[PDB]
């Protein structure tokens, strides 16, 4: 088991007597057990890229190889934890050490031992019964929300020889024992998985059910789908916090995993201060979103491989909750700072630089990351579907999207939510640019929309047209003044203003904009576009006649309709039932039709 | 407790190559083990083991290897990494870049022997920055307020007076005052005149009881220049996290630190990365800058105001560029203001203190402060835009309001930004100066201030 | 049809052999079974990145952007297996596909492919952002083998000349658009404004085409003439007078 340190040069430790070790095997070096990976073998010698500072490591110090490559422990106790980039739990490190520092060479297990959670075995299992990877052998009630499914690791299979009865047990207690080919394996609630390896599935499915964020601008103009991959331009003035907090509080996602991939020291602590304090309604109770989330967190000075691996730990955790049948959402907050940590590994390994100094494989590291998203038929017996979505924030240098990490990310991700400083400076939250943003998933979501919201596809189309006409007409408005435009252009601009200020803007701090259900989003946009179609009909139908309609005539005859349209954002689903909101929208439609009947 | 065993001394120098002396037959050598060299003439010299491999230990000597030989040179291995003799009595004292005193005082009687490398502050233990540090400079305190525990570099360039700004911050800086504040000023690759300026301008002006001063000269060894930030931050960590002090660290030239990293990487025969700097430059800059912030259940907090000489006046260079990625916003010193004799030459337009929203609030300053800074920003920006209009149209073509933004711009540079090297302005006086400039406009023109705030403070 | 799939999550080094498997199957079907085959090579950029990865991981001598110095020959060992061969009725036709990094035509991936293949079909944001499917920009496009394929019995006899004049009119149309964006219509001639109008008529009728709309070359040439008729006969300076006299009034 033990090898010996042969030499040390900066963060790279050469070792000897390592003949039984493997490429990318995880190794503890030095008496303090500094973490590192085998990057090369040269006979009985191995070269270990140490993660932590190597100061003080000596020739002939022990080299204790862990048999497995870099891996994530998976099980109960994942929920609510703040893991670092290599799954050292920062909460356990703080509690056990009673120190403000992470001590060099932590040995703390990722899932806390001695916490004897309530376990229920799967009622269908028996001694002698067949079992396979992804089969649920029991459930652990760790939180009121997440009934944590315990399931056989994807490589393991055979005949069940023991299951624990109902009772209290931890991560180290043996829960299942099974025999295959005459060999017995003992399993606990803890499972261990290689962080760079995809967890296999029965079928990777197309993504077709919306991931609602509760924000009108996102859910209306550029929808995202459960299982989908999306990106955000993360910067100071972008307003990313409005998306991030809203996603965690309101999304139709059963588990959230957030990954700090080298955020700034203070910016990381702002996130780790907020997520405990964020609360969500469930079953008429209020509970901390920490009941349904886990944070991987790394400040910029965390070990290089802790930053680089943090993105892969997040998706390995997220795939594990996907495999339980949960619709997981992953947020990665700094894919640029991850690509910097990736670049630092290549610089230490002396790999040749590609575009802008990033490694040649950056495209493959990103692409194999985002391809781990999607909806799936899970492994094992219950046939259950599950999914991982991935939100990947990117930081274009000075707003330049041509940097290889940003360019590749926007080339890979099927959705982009183009946050823009010019909108946030005017407090236009969520501050998403409705020209620069896009979503490729429309063709796949149209199945769901045709079933549940058949009117919506016409509406989103007309919305984009109205917004595009505003941008194209604005040049003429500057060149000759708004007063010189045609009547069909003037009503188009007013509806574009109505959409911009009273539909796309959403003040999530207020009681009324706190969350916007999809029904409210359709009903608001339906009324705005119905008013546009009637206004457009009135002006175009009277063009070249003696008697003629213009925006001033409409506003003079029905100014209360424009006011009622603006009032729709204030209508609150908590105060007013969905039937009442639907009836009010039916009344606005009848009101505007009767109002236009006075002109035509 | 302590290493009870005796030290070994080796004559077995198998070679010398640039700054490196290669011992052989060494017993159990450590990476970064501190060693003491003795030359043939009996002169002592310092060094660290830059590489270990079997019986070989590649010492990087701190001083140049000149005078070392294979047969009379003796290397003494201390059995440990370099540790800082640290204590609270390091306040009121001046140290060279290795931590040896240069103030005619004794060695430090230490309260601890902290690992020079430090350790990562646990992100769950980290607390968000919560209150202002006065720098005493109006262009910082009234436009770019610095939260206690923020990192905020002063970007500068060759020839600009950023060392004078660094020194003035180090004299004038303190809490808001609506003895528990300490400064750790640490200066790398400093030319001997600027080192006399830092030493004298603090020792002559009473501030020393609340500052610890580290000097590393331009001709001091390049490896001592790497150690200087680590001593500063180790002392700042001791003062804050062992001793509750609020601490402000002034790292006066991160460019010469990065140039020292370039040399230490060349010393390991590593291939150069981006613009000739090491690939791992981001982690080394982060290992300096993230030794900062507040921590759960302690009053202590390390703030950093690095100063950073931008190569070629261009933020795209890896030194400023990587620094912008790690630190929470930046202050720019500007050659335009410098040539116009506006001292401090701090350009408040491109500058941004990212955490100023935390630093400013009711009970931390006057409640109006955030609104004042926003309106001053707008009026100075519009004043610059109107100066560009004046340049095209001449004065007779301007409106009365345009003339107010010009009067504002002239008076704002000549009263708000201009401070002088020894006038100290508390945040209250900076805000009264701010209001004295805002009062140039009619009450209704102050579009970024609430009418309640205007009714309480617009009258003079 | 036969498919070889290497997905973005699959191992990158398989991408070296992924197109070679397709071609090795195409060589069997075409040269041993006399079939005609269209071979599609999706994401030659992701292929070239697998070469860039192997190159960087082997310390191979770099060409531009850090691709291996041999990248041209590796791409040629893929691309050159297209062709007919003597005494066999078979034929391998290749349509490779490549996304250009940062849309740069001078990037090693498009550029080396550019030298090896018989001209390029190109697709452009200037068309796609206006909903002009298929967004095929004709000016950067060409076919090196088109000249030999165009002619009597293969096509209408005029086809070569119609092409030559469509390129000229569309090219002038782009140049007068680039002028107008600075100076407005007041510094353009009436003829320059006609080339600007030709560019609008051309993209809306010639390029714009439905995802299931099928057009023969003959209908395409009738459309081409109805566009070329925008100018007076004497302006069509790439076409011989006999071709004009037969077809211009139709």
């Amino acid at each position: 088991t033990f090898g010996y340190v042969h030499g040390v040069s900066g963060p790279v430790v050469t070792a000897c007597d390592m003949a039984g070790a493997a490429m990318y095997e995880l190794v503890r070096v030095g008496h303090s057990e500094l973490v590192g990976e085998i990057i090369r073998l040269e006979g009985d010698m191995a070269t270990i890229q140490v993660y932590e500072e190597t100061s003080g490591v000596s020739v002939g110090d022990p080299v204790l190889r862990t048999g497995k490559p870099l891996s994530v422990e998976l099980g109960p106790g994942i929920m609510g934890a703040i893991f670092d980039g290599i799954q050292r739990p920062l909460s356990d490190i703080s509690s056990q050490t009673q120190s403000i520092y992470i001590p060099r060479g932590v040995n703390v297990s990722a899932l806390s031992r001695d916490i004897k959670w309530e376990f229920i075995p799967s009622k269908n299992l028996r001694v002698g019964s067949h079992i396979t990877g992804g089969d649920i052998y029991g459930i652990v009630n760790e939180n009121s929300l997440i009934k944590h499914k315990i399931m056989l690791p994807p490589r393991s299979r055979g005949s069940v020889t023991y299951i624990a009865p109902p009772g209290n047990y931890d991560a180290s207690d043996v829960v299942l024992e099974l025999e295959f080919e005459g060999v017995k394996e003992k399993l606990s609630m803890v499972q261990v998985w290689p962080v760079r390896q995809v967890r296999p599935v029965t079928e990777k499915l197309p993504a077709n059910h919306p991931l609602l964020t509760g924000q009108r601008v996102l859910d209306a103009l550029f929808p995202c789908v459960q299982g989908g991959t999306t990106a955000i331009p993360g910067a100071f003035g972008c307003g990313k916090t409005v998306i991030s907090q809203s996603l965690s509080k309101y999304s139709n996602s059963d588990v959230i995993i957030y990954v700090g991939c080298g955020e700034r020291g203070n910016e990381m602590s702002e996130v780790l201060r907020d997520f405990p304090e964020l609360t969500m309604e469930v079953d008429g109770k209020v509970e901390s979103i920490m009941k349904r989330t886990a944070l991987v967190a790394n400040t910029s000075n965390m070990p290089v491989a802790a930053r680089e691996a943090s993105i892969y730990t997040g998706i390995t955790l997220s795939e594990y909750f996907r495999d339980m049948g949960y619709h997981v959402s992953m947020m990665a907050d700094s894919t640029s700072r991850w690509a910097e940590a990736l670049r630092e590994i290549s610089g230490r390994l002396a790999e040749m630089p590609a575009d802008s100094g990033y490694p040649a494989y950056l495209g493959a590291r990103l692409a194999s990351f985002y391809e781990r998203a999607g909806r799936v038929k899970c492994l094992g017996n219950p046939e259950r579907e599950g999914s991982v979505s991935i939100v990947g924030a990117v930081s274009p240098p000075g707003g330049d999207f041509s940097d290889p990490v940003t360019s590749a990310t926007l080339g890979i991700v099927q959705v982009f939510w183009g946050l823009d400083k010019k909108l946030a400076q005017r407090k236009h939250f969520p501050s998403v640019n409705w020209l620069i943003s896009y979503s490729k998933y429309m063709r796949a979501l149209d199945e769901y929309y045709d079933k549940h919201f058949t009117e919506f596809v016409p509406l989103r189309t007309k919305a984009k047209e109205i917004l595009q006409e505003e941008e194209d007409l604005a040049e003429i408005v500057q060149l000759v003044g708004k007063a010189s435009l045609a009547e069909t252009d003037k009503i188009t601009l007013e509806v574009a203003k109505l959409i911009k200020d009273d539909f796309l803007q959403q003040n999530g701090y207020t009681p009324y904009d706190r969350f916007c259900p999809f029904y409210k989003t359709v009903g608001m946009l339906s009324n705005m576009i119905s008013f546009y179609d009637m206004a457009r009909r009135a002006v175009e139908t009277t063009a070249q006649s003696d008697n003629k309609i213009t925006w001033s005539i409409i506003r003079e005859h029905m100014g209360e309709i424009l006011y009622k349209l603006s009032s729709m954002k204030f209508k609150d689903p908590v105060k007013d039932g969905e039937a009442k909101i639907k009836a009010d929208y039916a009344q606005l439609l009848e009101d505007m039709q009767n109002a236009f009947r006075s002109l035509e | 407790n302590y290493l009870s065993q005796p030290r070994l001394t080796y004559k077995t120098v198998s070679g010398v190559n640039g700054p490196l002396v290669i011992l052989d037959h060494v017993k159990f050598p450590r990476y970064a083990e501190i060693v003491h060299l003795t030359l043939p003439d009996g002169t002592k010299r310092s060094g660290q083991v830059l590489e270990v491999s079997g019986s070989k230990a590649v010492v990087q000597v701190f001083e140049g290897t000149s005078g070392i030989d294979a047969k009379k040179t003796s290397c003494e291995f201390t059995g440990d990494i370099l540790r800082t003799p640290v204590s609270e009595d390091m306040l009121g004292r001046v140290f060279n870049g290795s931590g040896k005193p240069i103030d005619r005082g004794p060695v430090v009687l230490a309260e601890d022997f902290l690992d020079i490398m430090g350790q990562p502050i646990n992100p769950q233990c980290r607390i968000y920055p919560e209150e202002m540090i006065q720098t005493g400079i109006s262009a910082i305190d009234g436009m770019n307020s610095i939260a206690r525990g923020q990192k905020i570099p002063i970007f500068s360039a060759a020839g600009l007076p950023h060392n004078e700004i660094a020194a003035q911050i180090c004299r004038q800086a303190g809490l808001v005052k609506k003895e528990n504040f300490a400064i750790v000023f640490a200066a790398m690759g400093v030319n001997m005149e600027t080192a006399r300026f830092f030493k004298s301008d603090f020792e002559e002006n009473g501030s020393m009881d609340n500052v610890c001063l580290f000097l590393n000269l331009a001709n001091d060894p390049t490896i001592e220049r790497i150690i200087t930030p680590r001593l500063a931050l180790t002392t700042a960590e001791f003062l804050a996290y062992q001793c509750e002090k609020h601490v402000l660290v002034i790292l006066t030239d991160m460019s010469s630190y990065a140039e020292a990293l370039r040399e230490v990487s060349a010393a390991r025969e590593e291939v150069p990365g981006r613009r000739g700097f090491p690939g791992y430059m981001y982690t080394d800059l982060a290992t300096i800058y993230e030794r900062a912030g507040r921590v759960e259940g302690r009053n202590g907090s390390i703030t950093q105001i690095p100063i950073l000489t931008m190569p070629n006046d261009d933020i795209t260079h890896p030194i400023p560029d990587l620094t912008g990625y790690i630190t929470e916003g930046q202050i720019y010193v500007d050659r335009q203001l410098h040539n116009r004799q506006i001292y401090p030459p701090i350009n408040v337009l491109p500058s941004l203190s990212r955490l100023m929203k935390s630093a400013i609030g009711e009970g931390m300053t006057r409640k109006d402060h955030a609104d004042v800074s926003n309106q001053l920003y707008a009026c100075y920006a519009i004043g610059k835009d109107v100066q560009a209009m004046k340049a095209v149209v001449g004065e007779e073509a301007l409106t009365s309001d345009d003339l107010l933004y010009l009067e504002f711009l002239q008076k704002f540079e000549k009263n708000f930004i201009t401070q002088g090297p020894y006038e100290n302005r508390t945040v209250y006086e900076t805000l009264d100066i701010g209001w004295q400039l805002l009062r140039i406009f009619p009450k209704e023109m102050l579009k970024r201030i609430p009418q309640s705030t205007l009714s309480e403070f617009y009258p003079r | 049809v036969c498919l070889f799939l290497n997905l973005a999550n699959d191992p990158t080094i398989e991408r070296i052999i992924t197109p070679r498997l397709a071609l090795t199957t195409a060589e069997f079907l075409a040269y041993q079974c006399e079939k005609h085959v269209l071979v599609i090579l999706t994401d030659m950029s992701s292929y070239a990145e697998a070469l860039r990865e192997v190159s960087a991981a082997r310390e191979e001598v770099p060409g531009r952007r850090g691709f291996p110095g041999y990248m041209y020959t590796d791409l040629a060992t893929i691309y050159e297996r297209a062709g007919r061969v003597e005494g066999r009725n078979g034929s391998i036709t290749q349509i490779p596909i490549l996304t250009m990094p940062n849309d740069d035509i001078t990037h090693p991936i498009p550029d080396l492919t550019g030298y090896i293949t018989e001209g390029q079909i190109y697709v452009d944001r200037q068309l796609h952002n206006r909903q002009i499917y298929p967004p095929i920009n004709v000016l950067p496009s060409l076919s090196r083998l088109m000249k030999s394929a165009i002619g009597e019995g293969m096509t209408r006899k005029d086809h070569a000349d119609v092409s030559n004049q469509l390129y000229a009119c569309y090219a002038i149309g782009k140049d007068v658009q680039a002028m107008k964006a600075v100076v407005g219509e007041e510094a353009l001639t009436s003829d320059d404004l006609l080339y600007l109008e030709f560019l609008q008529k051309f993209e809306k009728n010639f390029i714009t085409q439905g995802p299931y709309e099928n057009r023969t070359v003959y209908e395409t040439l009738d459309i081409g003439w109805q566009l070329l008729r925008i100018f007076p006969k004497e302006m069509l300076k790439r076409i011989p007078q006999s071709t004009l006299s037969e077809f211009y009034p139709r």
Partner: peptide, 23 residues
């Protein structure tokens, strides 16, 4: 970067050969 990686490789080979020649 490439030129310097090759130089460093040549030095590594010359170091190894110089050690092997002393055995």
């Amino acid at each position: 970067f490439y030129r310097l990686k090759k130089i460093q490789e040549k030095k590594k080979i010359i170091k190894e050969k110089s050690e092997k020649d002393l055995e």
